[PDB]
Amino acid sequence: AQNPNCNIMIFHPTKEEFNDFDKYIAYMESQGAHRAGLAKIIPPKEWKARETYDNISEILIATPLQQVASGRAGVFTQYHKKKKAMTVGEYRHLANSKKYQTPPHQNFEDLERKYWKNRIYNSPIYGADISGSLFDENTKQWNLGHLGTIQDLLEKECGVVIEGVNTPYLYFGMWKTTFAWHTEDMDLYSINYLHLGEPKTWYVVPPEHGQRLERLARELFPGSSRGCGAFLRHKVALISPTVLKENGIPFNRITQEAGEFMVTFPYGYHAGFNHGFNCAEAINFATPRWIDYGKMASQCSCGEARVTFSMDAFVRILQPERYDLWKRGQD
């Protein structure tokens, strides 16, 4: 078995190997990459996502989210308070302000220490989940707006044609902006490109050990667990590396820098934080190997998780027994 310790693997494809996206994902899996839940892909030196980022300031962040924490430094939840619209140029200026900017630090490890010590005492503002793309249309390789769609994959594998679409999302971050512990909708893959700016630190639990994280989460967030049998679908709970190590939960960490891709694998729980002003693009995708994960994915039916239009068909076809209850939670 390849990668039996479930380490995060880093790949350096050549420009030739960068042509065929599906083939490269299958290659990484042949080497055991998926066992970690997360892999890094450093693009060939010849590749670029677009020519420059000089003209992005007029993108609108219609609903910036202030991430307000509750709990203790290593075990907390966050809620999202909606803020007034602002442009990316306005948000960048805010991120760089004395109130929100990255503090002085020695290295990534020092900054990680400061994040876990101090995150709860601040409320950073995240421009998340913005439909759109920063890839130039002429970028042919690993262009996250030109991927094969999940609907087409389900149709190829299973023969059933379904409604729905699959488009990317932009994320504008600042120091301390946080993504809570989650797997993807329907335990899909994700791919995330850091277009510009400061790094993003990731934590990940191997898929084979995801239920260990779920059991800890039920212990640590006991009211939330009574409220919903899949409350990590709400995407609000944080648990620090120190707490994970105290509780024997297997995990790994890595920092993504500008110009790098990350892939999350089916049922790979992940969480993390941004170092400073940045912009990422991410989208979900599927492969043949996903289908069995999609069939077994948990679902929130309490009403909190509320997701896209396109998830309806996935539930309906892959999980017909759950459909009725899950759809009630959507309506």
Ligand X SMILES: O=C(O)CNC(=O)C(=O)O
Q: Shortest approach of ligand X to residue 264 CB, angstroms? A: 5
Q: Shortest approach of Zn ion to residue 300 CB, angstroms? A: 3
**Does residue number 264 form part of the binding site for ligand X (CB under 6 A)?**
yes
Residue number with CB closer to Ni ion (176 or 200): 200
Give the binding-site size for Zn ion (rule: CB under 5 A).
Answer: 4
Phi first, then psi: what are they for 193, rounded to 5°? Answer: -110, 125
Residues near 133 by beta carbon (within 8 Å), at least 6 away in sequence? 144, 145, 167, 168, 170, 281
Q: Distance between CA 76 and CA 201 in Å, rounded?
A: 18
Residue number with CB closer to Zn ion (117 or 226): 226
Residue number with CB closer to Zn ion (48 or 235): 235
Token look-up 């995990």 returns: 251
The maximal CA–CA distance of the chain, rounded, in angstroms, is: 55
Look up residue 5 and give its DSSP letter.
Answer: T
Q: Distance between CA 286 and CA 190 in Å, rounded?
A: 8
Neighbours of 10 (CB within 10 A): 12
Please answer whether residues 326 and 254 qualify as being in contact, where contact means their C-beta atoms are separated by less than 8 angstroms. Answer: no
Q: Is 40 annotated as a binding residue?
A: no
Please count the residues of the chain: 331
Look up residue 137 and give its DSSP letter.
Answer: T
Which parts of 148-177 interact with ligand X (CB under 6 A)?
171
Q: Shortest approach of ligand X to residue 219 CB, angstroms? A: 24
Q: Is 126 annotated as a binding residue?
A: yes
Q: Is 235 annotated as a binding residue?
A: yes
Among 243, 258, 302, 307, binds Zn ion (CB under 5 A): 302
Look up residue 119 and give its DSSP letter.
Answer: G
Residue number with CB closer to Zn ion (296 or 325): 325
Token look-up 């962040």 returns: 61
Q: Is 19 annotated as a binding residue?
A: no
Q: Shortest approach of Ni ion to residue 103 CB, angstroms? A: 26
Q: Is 171 exposed, middle or buried (0-12, 13-18, 19+ CB in 10 A)?
A: buried
Among 46, 54, 58, 331, binds Mg ion (CB under 5 A): 58
Q: Is 93 annotated as a binding residue?
A: no
Residues interacting with Zn ion, by CB under 5 A?
228, 300, 302, 304
Residues interacting with ligand X, by CB under 6 A?
171, 179, 190, 192, 200, 264, 270, 280, 282
Residues interacting with Ni ion, by CB under 5 A?
190
Residues annotated in a binding site: 126, 182, 184, 192, 200, 228, 234-235, 270, 300, 302
